[PDB]
């Protein structure tokens, strides 16, 4: 099972930026316009049209992947072997593999 | 396959490449609140976990179980075996003593 | 251990973000829920909240809880704290940013703790499931039965099998410190912060450590403030704005880890056999949906499997 | 749920009453819910306002 | 019938004999805790009800 | 009546045993649940716990509860007591080893 993580996005009180593609598994990034965001008791990081948003996304393996995980295999004939218990004449039970 | 059985395929146990997709998609945040919405297909590994068919150890013909570690297919009874054994000559006795 | 708790508390600090607790219509709380996790067969879940648990400001008394009050830190004794899915749960352990608890099935996960004026509750609509091991469904594993290998989240304070990055906090907007001087705005400093203030005219938009003011406008309503602090660090999250902070990819070991262990399973009631010659007759009296599988041993298998729910007979 | 109950304390009493009465959670649009999520599409709904008068 | 319709058949209203079976079975207690596990077929009287 | 309560309290005493309260992994408590019973059509149930309810050590004040603390007896006023199935229930009566309450499914 996978898991998606997201770094903290970046905004600006004015102007705009552009996001770049990085070499990551199913990397994503995009920009949005006219945010006028909000914060706790804050000035809300805006005075005008914001047009700043990063919202990048990121995919990687889960932390529990170490335990449960399917595996695929290719199969060919391989060997054959067994074990045998033996007794003859008066000798007792003797066992060995072959 | 966008989450059917392969959506996170690490070539090894601790590789650094995952050559599969999850159909990730982003969304536009609303109401000026700092968050990063998104959407994606649910993991197909879970789906295959829910709909696994009959395990092999309940369909193998000829009545033979399946160990794990060497992929042993034990006791699978079939056919015959050509045997050839030699005993020491010290275990015989003269025909006139019986 | 205490050293690992220190490395957790060395630079971390609580923080405030929004949660959609609809009892109060999108409230911003110190207890902000983020990515609850549950995949253990036993029905346990661990939740990664937005407040520091365990040690006080000194770094002891793991019965303490520290959060963000207004714009400051504040630690207090854990007085009343609860996690509720559909019925009150029972929590097991807690450390810093994480709590490991045991809940019954439900649909919406909520967490709340009292301080005396507030109940400080947040809610996330998120599916939670109780997965039974083996072949017999449960409502909860009984006292006696068979053992099986299961997997669940351990309950040790420290480990290193995984860790998450702690990162430089960004700027924090504010206006309360923007007062009136005598006939214009006025900026005060919290004695160690860069008060990034900006108004109709280009102000010092990086923050000064000295109290100051500008007369481009008299009303506070044209000027904004943005406190800058770099004494602590936080776990970067998509629910938190990021400033120019791109430094200190610090590491913080996860408190709990999924490990393999042993669980207790239920043994179904005995069947009633009937060796009626040339065939076989079975009477079954289950108490939960219980599996059944048969196979031949000849050339062909002819497998057969289906669940059983009502007491029945098969041939 | 199925039965609506209301209770308030005075100190000697819990003052609780109960009415057996069906209660339902109706989802808007086309996707069933357990509770509306944080993000998604907007739709016109109807609900009881929260003004005093 | 091991809990189909007759599993507790008192000959009278207050007899002292119950000539029927319930397929009772015992179990081995585990973890060194004093308890007496067991298992049995559910009552057939309920099923007929 | 009080005489029957005395015959209940004449020689009985609480005791401690194990319960599988998995919030704390097989804890041993004075409140050990034994053979809860419910077959009434109205949805009532009575439970036979492992602690003495009702009378104090003297044998009055049926609002008291006596249990085993460590290796001794101990009675105390019923402060907060609840029975929960999936939602909080409402208890009706209690006497010695037994409690009769009303619960939802």
XYZ file of C-alpha atoms in Angstrom:
718
model
C 0.000 0.000 0.000
C 1.280 3.441 -0.938
C 1.124 6.819 0.792
C 1.041 10.387 -0.502
C 2.886 13.199 1.246
C 2.783 16.925 0.593
C 5.384 19.532 1.567
C 4.227 22.840 2.938
C 2.920 25.050 0.107
C 4.217 28.563 -0.486
C 2.224 31.746 -1.091
C 3.089 35.416 -1.532
C 1.302 38.545 -0.360
C 1.652 39.883 -3.917
C 2.840 38.830 -7.342
C 3.099 35.257 -8.535
C 5.626 32.486 -9.110
C 5.866 29.373 -11.268
C 6.456 25.790 -10.207
C 9.000 23.433 -11.753
C 8.908 19.680 -12.341
C 11.301 17.574 -10.280
C 12.375 13.946 -10.824
C 9.998 12.236 -8.425
C 7.542 9.342 -8.721
C 4.323 10.911 -10.019
C 5.433 14.414 -9.100
C 2.850 17.183 -9.266
C 2.775 20.959 -8.959
C 0.395 23.719 -9.985
C -0.437 27.358 -9.273
C -3.713 29.081 -8.434
C -4.961 32.657 -8.492
C -6.719 35.118 -6.209
C -6.201 33.467 -2.840
C -6.761 36.131 -0.173
C -5.948 33.525 2.495
C -6.587 33.540 6.228
C -4.714 32.762 9.444
C -5.313 32.725 13.185
C -5.802 36.314 14.348
C -3.414 37.313 11.582
C -3.215 39.800 8.751
C -3.973 36.816 6.490
C -0.928 37.381 4.268
C -2.799 39.446 1.696
C -3.448 43.003 0.577
C -4.490 42.426 -3.057
C -4.919 39.674 -5.637
C -2.621 36.945 -4.352
C -2.314 34.443 -7.217
C 0.212 32.340 -5.291
C -0.167 28.631 -4.576
C 2.262 25.711 -4.818
C 0.255 22.637 -3.736
C 2.823 20.078 -4.835
C 2.108 16.377 -4.364
C 4.410 13.449 -3.797
C 4.139 9.645 -3.749
C 6.309 7.064 -1.991
C 6.145 3.731 -0.195
C 4.388 3.321 3.131
C 6.133 2.684 6.435
C 4.301 -0.634 6.862
C 5.463 -1.928 3.478
C 8.317 -3.702 5.280
C 6.056 -6.471 6.623
C 3.151 -7.266 4.291
C 4.050 -7.207 0.615
C 3.201 -9.412 -2.326
C 6.088 -10.774 -4.365
C 6.104 -11.912 -7.972
C 8.209 -14.812 -9.181
C 9.230 -16.721 -12.264
C 9.397 -20.487 -11.941
C 11.386 -23.262 -13.610
C 11.738 -26.981 -13.062
C 14.284 -27.194 -10.278
C 15.363 -30.295 -8.394
C 13.712 -33.210 -6.563
C 14.664 -34.787 -3.248
C 13.252 -36.879 -0.419
C 14.136 -38.777 2.753
C 13.994 -42.509 3.467
C 13.895 -44.736 6.548
C 15.554 -48.102 5.985
C 15.819 -51.490 7.688
C 17.209 -54.794 6.417
C 18.299 -58.117 7.846
C 18.700 -57.359 11.530
C 19.896 -53.741 11.345
C 17.518 -51.308 13.027
C 15.743 -48.289 11.555
C 18.145 -45.991 9.718
C 17.147 -42.756 8.027
C 18.793 -40.447 5.508
C 17.874 -38.083 2.692
C 18.885 -38.319 -0.949
C -2.984 -0.219 -13.923
C -4.044 2.814 -11.874
C -4.713 0.705 -8.826
C -5.798 -2.769 -9.852
C -2.861 -4.895 -8.736
C 0.208 -2.906 -9.694
C 0.367 0.728 -8.700
C 3.546 0.785 -6.590
C 6.082 -1.675 -8.004
C 9.448 -1.394 -6.290
C 11.920 -3.392 -8.368
C 13.607 -4.513 -5.141
C 12.903 -4.498 -1.421
C 14.645 -1.143 -0.946
C 14.858 0.263 -4.463
C 14.430 3.969 -5.147
C 12.145 3.804 -8.183
C 8.417 3.042 -8.377
C 7.467 2.697 -12.033
C 3.717 2.872 -11.674
C 0.930 5.438 -11.584
C -1.850 6.312 -9.160
C -3.807 8.819 -11.290
C -3.134 11.597 -8.794
C -4.990 14.865 -9.323
C -4.954 18.231 -7.586
C -7.745 20.627 -6.644
C -8.154 24.322 -6.086
C -8.337 25.361 -2.427
C -11.360 27.425 -1.469
C -12.404 30.053 1.067
C -8.846 31.303 1.521
C -7.754 28.598 3.964
C -4.245 27.160 3.742
C -4.649 23.525 2.699
C -3.795 21.342 -0.291
C -6.772 19.357 -1.599
C -6.303 16.490 -4.025
C -7.842 13.241 -5.224
C -6.637 9.853 -6.408
C -7.746 6.293 -7.081
C -7.796 4.033 -4.002
C -4.959 1.545 -3.775
C -5.526 -1.511 -5.933
C -3.444 -3.671 -3.628
C -6.279 -3.450 -1.115
C -8.796 -4.462 -3.760
C -6.805 -7.549 -4.659
C -6.475 -8.290 -0.956
C -10.262 -8.319 -0.679
C -10.906 -10.453 -3.772
C -8.185 -13.083 -3.692
C -9.449 -16.272 -5.292
C -8.830 -19.771 -4.079
C -5.343 -20.132 -2.576
C -3.258 -22.790 -4.265
C -2.988 -24.895 -1.124
C -6.710 -25.640 -1.461
C -6.752 -26.523 -5.168
C -3.598 -28.561 -5.796
C -4.561 -31.950 -7.239
C -3.201 -35.281 -5.973
C -3.469 -33.997 -2.417
C -0.196 -32.250 -1.680
C 0.366 -29.318 0.659
C 2.665 -26.352 0.064
C 5.420 -25.239 2.402
C 6.689 -21.677 2.096
C 10.404 -21.097 2.616
C 11.806 -23.175 -0.298
C 8.417 -23.307 -2.057
C 8.320 -26.986 -1.199
C 5.477 -28.911 -2.810
C 5.583 -31.841 -0.433
C 4.199 -35.365 -0.688
C 2.674 -34.883 -4.128
C 2.002 -38.547 -4.783
C 2.265 -39.679 -8.404
C 3.851 -42.425 -10.460
C 6.548 -44.905 -9.523
C 10.288 -44.880 -8.847
C 13.112 -47.110 -10.142
C 15.081 -48.232 -7.109
C 18.523 -49.834 -6.942
C 20.173 -50.732 -3.643
C 23.284 -52.665 -2.641
C 23.759 -54.396 0.710
C 27.120 -55.426 2.195
C 28.102 -59.038 1.709
C 28.781 -59.420 5.435
C 25.042 -59.778 6.119
C 24.554 -63.057 4.247
C 25.084 -66.536 5.633
C 25.705 -70.006 4.282
C 22.632 -71.825 3.015
C 23.476 -74.868 5.143
C 23.004 -73.009 8.441
C 19.334 -72.313 8.101
C 14.140 6.421 27.564
C 14.457 10.175 27.972
C 17.113 11.037 25.399
C 14.794 10.230 22.497
C 12.096 12.330 24.136
C 14.639 15.155 24.263
C 15.480 14.785 20.576
C 11.729 14.983 20.033
C 11.470 18.073 22.257
C 14.810 19.603 21.263
C 13.353 21.896 18.598
C 9.740 20.841 18.106
C 6.857 22.990 19.290
C 3.064 22.876 18.997
C 1.240 24.834 16.327
C -2.267 25.973 15.428
C -4.248 25.140 12.301
C -7.829 24.642 11.164
C -10.123 21.682 11.701
C -13.670 21.314 10.399
C -15.323 20.618 13.743
C -18.796 21.462 12.506
C -20.181 21.848 16.005
C -18.489 25.235 15.620
C -18.149 25.643 11.834
C -14.494 25.341 10.770
C -12.669 26.274 13.965
C -8.931 26.849 14.225
C -7.467 24.847 17.100
C -4.128 23.798 18.541
C -5.505 20.239 18.289
C -5.508 19.916 14.508
C -6.052 16.371 13.280
C -3.691 15.161 10.561
C -3.655 11.758 8.822
C -5.098 9.304 11.299
C -3.754 5.822 10.629
C -5.441 2.495 11.136
C -4.555 -0.795 9.481
C -3.985 -3.131 12.431
C -6.062 -6.283 12.680
C -6.706 -5.829 16.399
C -8.600 -2.584 15.838
C -6.034 -0.176 17.269
C -5.405 3.221 15.700
C -2.814 5.934 16.192
C -3.473 9.586 15.438
C -0.946 12.325 14.710
C -2.304 15.540 16.183
C -0.832 19.051 16.181
C 0.118 19.427 19.857
C 3.095 18.223 21.862
C 2.335 15.572 24.470
C 4.309 14.051 27.287
C 7.106 16.227 28.583
C 6.670 19.704 30.010
C 8.829 22.677 29.033
C 11.639 21.235 31.167
C 11.459 17.834 29.465
C 10.054 15.467 32.101
C 6.697 14.356 33.521
C 5.289 12.602 30.486
C 1.851 13.210 32.045
C 2.035 16.809 30.780
C 0.737 18.384 27.584
C 2.066 21.500 25.860
C 0.105 23.419 23.234
C 0.000 26.875 21.650
C -2.145 29.433 23.464
C -2.615 32.507 21.310
C 0.934 33.209 20.139
C 2.797 31.551 23.024
C 3.625 28.150 24.465
C 1.714 26.668 27.381
C 2.029 23.363 29.219
C -0.616 21.933 31.531
C -1.414 18.679 33.284
C -3.545 16.248 31.309
C -6.875 16.737 33.083
C -9.550 15.246 30.814
C -8.712 13.798 27.417
C -10.790 11.488 25.270
C -10.964 9.963 21.807
C -14.392 9.056 20.455
C -15.459 7.213 17.327
C -19.054 6.187 18.029
C -18.532 5.152 21.644
C -15.836 6.391 24.026
C -12.556 4.674 23.264
C -9.645 3.785 25.550
C -6.250 5.320 24.877
C -3.051 3.351 25.436
C -0.044 5.631 25.033
C 0.913 9.106 23.908
C 4.186 10.798 23.033
C 4.745 14.277 21.659
C 2.805 14.564 18.414
C 1.183 11.124 18.563
C -1.455 9.169 20.473
C -2.099 5.421 20.236
C -5.579 4.342 21.297
C -8.155 1.582 20.895
C -11.552 2.338 19.350
C -14.636 0.435 18.198
C -15.901 0.794 14.621
C -17.493 4.004 13.463
C -17.411 6.701 10.822
C -16.089 9.968 12.263
C -13.015 10.227 14.475
C -13.022 12.963 17.091
C -10.617 13.998 19.838
C -11.216 16.378 22.712
C -9.462 17.642 25.828
C -10.481 20.134 28.492
C -8.662 23.138 29.882
C -11.587 24.510 31.903
C -13.062 27.125 29.582
C -12.770 25.001 26.443
C -13.456 21.448 25.348
C -10.967 21.717 22.455
C -12.558 19.129 20.183
C -11.839 18.404 16.531
C -13.484 15.976 14.148
C -12.514 14.300 10.885
C -14.904 12.309 8.723
C -12.825 9.212 8.053
C -13.725 5.547 7.684
C -12.554 3.221 10.454
C -12.763 -0.562 10.259
C -12.374 -3.593 12.528
C -10.629 -6.329 10.556
C -10.936 -9.887 11.906
C -8.014 -12.289 11.640
C -8.339 -15.865 10.450
C -11.722 -17.032 9.236
C -14.370 -16.138 11.842
C -15.773 -12.637 11.994
C -15.742 -10.869 15.339
C -17.202 -8.165 17.410
C -14.157 -8.412 19.648
C -11.721 -11.315 20.119
C -12.828 -13.579 22.962
C -10.893 -14.687 26.024
C -9.960 -18.150 24.745
C -9.268 -19.822 21.435
C -6.529 -20.391 18.900
C -3.479 -18.204 18.303
C -2.591 -16.673 14.957
C 0.145 -14.372 13.627
C -1.173 -10.823 13.331
C 0.314 -7.364 12.906
C -0.265 -4.229 14.944
C 1.343 -1.012 16.120
C 3.740 -1.512 19.011
C 3.543 0.540 22.196
C 7.147 1.507 22.930
C 8.125 5.118 23.536
C 11.045 5.211 21.111
C 12.416 3.459 18.041
C 14.206 4.158 14.786
C 12.623 2.319 11.901
C 11.098 5.450 10.425
C 11.221 9.190 10.960
C 9.757 12.383 9.538
C 11.381 15.699 8.746
C 11.148 18.696 11.044
C 11.448 21.928 9.107
C 11.916 25.661 9.503
C 8.643 27.411 10.413
C 7.345 30.100 8.095
C 6.076 33.565 8.893
C 2.973 34.099 11.020
C 0.522 36.860 10.162
C -0.767 39.175 12.867
C -2.389 42.537 13.494
C -2.826 42.714 17.282
C 0.675 44.121 17.806
C -0.207 46.813 15.232
C -1.493 49.526 17.550
C -2.008 53.262 17.086
C 1.035 55.300 18.036
C -0.536 58.661 18.747
C -2.103 59.461 15.355
C -0.702 56.684 13.125
C 0.071 52.977 13.207
C 2.581 51.629 15.711
C 4.667 48.454 15.618
C 5.930 46.753 18.765
C 8.445 43.919 18.895
C 8.129 40.712 20.953
C 11.832 41.096 21.835
C 13.402 38.681 19.392
C 11.090 38.663 16.387
C 11.247 40.248 12.942
C 7.946 42.094 12.637
C 7.476 42.052 8.865
C 5.162 45.030 8.447
C 3.836 46.411 5.172
C 1.362 49.185 4.385
C 0.323 51.411 1.476
C 3.919 52.486 1.100
C 6.762 49.953 0.859
C 7.667 49.371 4.497
C 10.303 47.143 6.052
C 8.796 43.956 4.637
C 11.380 41.726 6.320
C 10.848 42.524 9.999
C 12.762 44.588 12.533
C 13.650 43.815 16.132
C 13.050 47.442 17.175
C 9.655 49.007 17.782
C 8.795 51.470 15.034
C 5.947 53.027 13.069
C 5.161 54.547 9.685
C 2.836 57.350 8.617
C 1.889 56.169 5.124
C -1.476 55.481 6.772
C -2.863 56.232 10.213
C -5.369 53.379 10.370
C -4.077 49.906 11.154
C -6.415 48.590 8.452
C -3.952 49.470 5.683
C -0.905 47.834 7.288
C -0.244 44.153 7.977
C 2.238 42.507 10.331
C 4.018 39.170 10.008
C 5.968 37.937 13.011
C 9.098 35.945 12.201
C 10.514 33.505 14.742
C 13.279 30.936 14.393
C 13.865 29.538 17.883
C 11.884 26.313 17.422
C 10.877 24.047 14.560
C 7.686 22.360 13.406
C 6.647 19.445 11.223
C 5.822 20.939 7.840
C 2.268 20.177 6.789
C -0.041 21.033 3.931
C -2.350 22.703 6.446
C 0.358 25.191 7.420
C 1.739 28.010 5.253
C 5.441 27.952 4.496
C 7.544 31.088 4.331
C 10.993 31.242 2.805
C 11.876 28.466 5.257
C 13.744 25.863 3.229
C 16.384 24.832 5.779
C 17.050 22.271 8.511
C 15.781 18.975 7.156
C 15.898 17.626 10.688
C 14.792 14.120 11.606
C 12.264 12.970 14.202
C 11.825 9.259 14.809
C 8.255 7.973 14.744
C 7.071 6.948 18.219
C 5.242 3.753 17.281
C 5.846 1.204 14.545
C 3.792 -1.665 13.088
C 5.301 -5.018 14.040
C 4.267 -8.632 13.743
C 2.862 -10.255 16.869
C 0.385 -12.895 18.009
C -3.375 -12.528 18.357
C -6.110 -14.733 19.773
C -8.776 -16.158 17.478
C -12.111 -17.872 18.003
C -12.651 -21.604 17.589
C -15.936 -22.447 15.917
C -18.348 -24.885 17.583
C -17.943 -28.519 16.682
C -19.632 -30.004 13.620
C -21.989 -32.964 13.799
C -20.637 -35.668 11.525
C -22.542 -38.496 9.863
C -20.515 -41.195 8.099
C -23.482 -42.491 6.142
C -21.863 -45.068 3.932
C -20.933 -44.250 0.300
C -21.315 -40.540 1.154
C -20.910 -37.984 3.949
C -23.425 -35.857 5.856
C -22.599 -32.780 7.917
C -24.630 -30.686 10.344
C -23.261 -27.221 11.078
C -24.230 -24.809 13.865
C -22.104 -21.667 13.561
C -22.276 -18.533 15.672
C -20.575 -16.162 13.222
C -20.160 -16.297 9.454
C -17.646 -19.111 9.215
C -15.711 -20.471 6.268
C -15.815 -23.979 4.822
C -13.546 -25.656 2.277
C -13.387 -29.135 0.769
C -11.346 -30.849 -1.903
C -10.865 -34.279 -3.409
C -7.537 -36.103 -3.525
C -7.778 -37.830 -6.912
C -6.758 -36.548 -10.311
C -9.239 -33.667 -10.115
C -9.677 -31.250 -7.229
C -13.303 -30.085 -7.523
C -12.818 -27.381 -4.876
C -15.783 -26.111 -2.900
C -15.997 -23.121 -0.584
C -18.676 -20.800 0.740
C -19.609 -19.032 3.927
C -22.085 -20.458 6.417
C -24.506 -18.277 8.332
C -27.571 -20.304 9.327
C -27.445 -23.772 10.890
C -27.689 -26.143 7.951
C -26.831 -29.572 6.571
C -24.603 -30.414 3.619
C -23.907 -33.534 1.579
C -29.953 7.082 14.944
C -33.391 5.959 16.029
C -34.358 7.567 19.342
C -33.887 11.249 20.137
C -33.175 12.135 23.748
C -32.417 15.376 25.573
C -31.107 15.843 29.086
C -29.929 18.620 31.383
C -28.683 18.613 34.961
C -29.747 20.669 37.945
C -27.747 18.721 40.538
C -30.315 16.304 41.942
C -31.846 15.438 38.572
C -30.700 14.566 35.075
C -34.034 15.679 33.562
C -33.955 13.458 30.489
C -36.738 12.701 28.026
C -36.805 10.378 25.046
C -38.906 10.057 21.903
C -38.738 7.116 19.522
C -38.511 8.922 16.197
C -36.659 8.149 12.980
C -33.768 10.450 12.085
C -31.980 10.385 8.742
C -28.843 11.809 7.120
C -29.694 12.770 3.547
C -26.764 13.219 1.141
C -26.873 15.919 -1.519
C -25.926 15.342 -5.135
C -25.051 11.824 -6.202
C -22.458 10.388 -3.790
C -23.543 8.974 -0.462
C -21.794 10.239 2.646
C -20.957 9.579 6.195
C -20.203 13.272 6.569
C -19.306 15.848 3.895
C -15.541 16.088 3.439
C -13.305 19.140 3.624
C -12.951 19.672 -0.129
C -14.987 19.078 -3.248
C -17.717 20.608 -5.359
C -20.398 23.046 -4.210
C -24.116 22.444 -4.596
C -27.311 24.295 -3.646
C -28.806 22.778 -0.500
C -31.398 23.784 2.074
C -31.124 23.894 5.847
C -32.383 25.661 8.948
C -30.749 29.033 9.509
C -29.183 30.009 12.822
C -30.419 33.550 13.455
C -32.086 34.491 16.726
C -35.124 36.195 15.214
C -30.834 -33.886 18.453
C -27.953 -31.749 19.738
C -30.043 -28.618 19.656
C -32.638 -28.849 16.913
C -35.875 -29.070 18.877
C -35.124 -31.421 21.742
C -32.020 -30.807 23.794
C -33.507 -30.373 27.281
C -36.533 -32.645 27.691
C -37.832 -32.660 31.248
C -40.317 -35.518 31.509
C -42.454 -33.348 33.800
C -42.694 -29.720 34.853
C -40.388 -30.271 37.836
C -38.691 -33.573 37.060
C -35.055 -34.193 37.945
C -33.883 -35.850 34.727
C -33.097 -34.292 31.341
C -32.522 -37.097 28.853
C -30.952 -35.090 26.072
C -27.544 -33.889 24.932
C -26.010 -30.520 24.111
C -22.663 -31.667 22.649
C -20.753 -29.903 25.413
C -16.981 -29.712 25.039
C -14.178 -28.367 27.205
C -11.045 -26.398 26.360
C -7.603 -25.918 27.793
C -7.106 -22.636 29.659
C -4.186 -20.529 28.498
C -1.748 -17.942 29.840
C -2.062 -19.218 33.404
C -5.296 -17.390 34.226
C -7.940 -19.098 36.353
C -10.941 -19.643 34.083
C -12.836 -22.571 32.574
C -13.297 -22.279 28.803
C -15.743 -24.493 26.950
C -17.930 -24.684 23.862
C -21.313 -26.097 22.921
C -24.026 -25.998 20.277
C -26.500 -23.112 20.642
C -29.902 -24.059 21.993
C -32.154 -25.554 19.347
C -35.259 -24.327 21.128
C -34.311 -20.819 20.034
C -33.875 -21.977 16.453
C -37.332 -23.510 16.392
C -38.662 -20.323 17.956
C -37.335 -5.106 53.112
C -34.106 -5.137 55.098
C -34.055 -8.672 56.484
C -33.485 -10.185 53.043
C -30.712 -7.667 52.452
C -29.182 -8.871 55.719
C -29.378 -12.515 54.659
C -27.628 -11.353 51.498
C -25.008 -9.460 53.526
C -24.827 -11.931 56.415
C -21.819 -13.825 55.053
C -21.269 -12.593 51.504
C -18.317 -10.404 50.591
C -16.867 -8.979 47.373
C -14.016 -10.691 45.577
C -11.464 -10.020 42.849
C -11.022 -11.883 39.572
C -9.896 -11.281 36.004
C -11.733 -9.583 33.167
C -10.481 -9.152 29.610
C -10.883 -5.383 29.429
C -8.568 -5.009 26.460
C -8.116 -1.293 27.010
C -5.670 -2.615 29.606
C -4.947 -6.180 28.425
C -6.545 -8.728 30.778
C -6.842 -6.743 33.998
C -7.848 -8.205 37.349
C -10.622 -6.147 38.925
C -13.095 -6.265 41.789
C -15.740 -5.640 39.099
C -15.544 -8.997 37.341
C -18.385 -9.612 34.908
C -20.076 -13.008 35.135
C -22.954 -14.348 33.006
C -24.923 -11.327 31.892
C -28.533 -12.285 31.239
C -30.943 -10.858 28.723
C -34.069 -12.508 27.360
C -36.799 -9.964 28.114
C -38.860 -8.608 25.247
C -38.671 -5.029 26.512
C -34.896 -4.912 26.099
C -33.922 -4.932 29.770
C -30.888 -6.844 31.011
C -29.526 -7.735 34.425
C -25.851 -8.365 35.090
C -24.282 -10.320 37.941
C -21.013 -8.620 38.817
C -18.416 -9.513 41.453
C -18.930 -6.672 43.947
C -21.471 -6.116 46.698
C -23.910 -3.268 46.106
C -26.443 -1.519 48.267
C -25.754 -1.747 51.971
C -22.610 -0.514 53.676
C -20.648 -2.545 56.222
C -23.357 -1.784 58.794
C -26.151 -2.995 56.508
C -28.078 0.144 55.531
C -27.927 2.976 52.984
C -28.563 1.004 49.825
C -26.837 3.880 47.987
C -23.482 2.423 49.085
C -21.122 0.034 47.325
C -18.602 -2.308 48.945
C -15.738 -3.917 47.042
C -12.356 -5.522 47.713
C -9.410 -3.124 47.828
C -6.155 -5.050 47.804
C -6.786 -7.717 50.440
C -9.408 -5.850 52.484
C -13.012 -4.697 52.356
C -13.970 -1.144 51.458
C -17.331 0.585 51.129
C -17.870 3.920 49.404
C -20.728 6.062 48.166
C -21.828 5.405 44.600
C -20.281 8.432 42.892
C -20.271 7.688 39.154
C -21.481 4.378 37.770
C -22.469 3.536 34.223
C -23.337 0.620 31.964
C -22.613 0.991 28.259
C -23.455 -1.209 25.296
C -23.039 1.081 22.286
C -24.654 4.152 23.826
C -24.916 5.003 27.525
C -27.687 2.987 29.118
C -29.953 3.802 32.067
C -29.831 1.593 35.139
C -32.970 0.811 37.129
C -32.051 -1.036 40.315
C -29.136 -2.701 42.042
C -28.796 -5.048 44.996
C -25.685 -6.759 46.298
C -24.230 -8.821 43.468
C -26.721 -7.736 40.804
C -27.687 -4.729 38.695
C -30.800 -4.402 36.522
C -30.525 -1.838 33.736
C -31.947 -0.869 30.352
C -29.702 -0.799 27.277
C -30.047 -0.333 23.519
C -28.754 -2.997 21.119
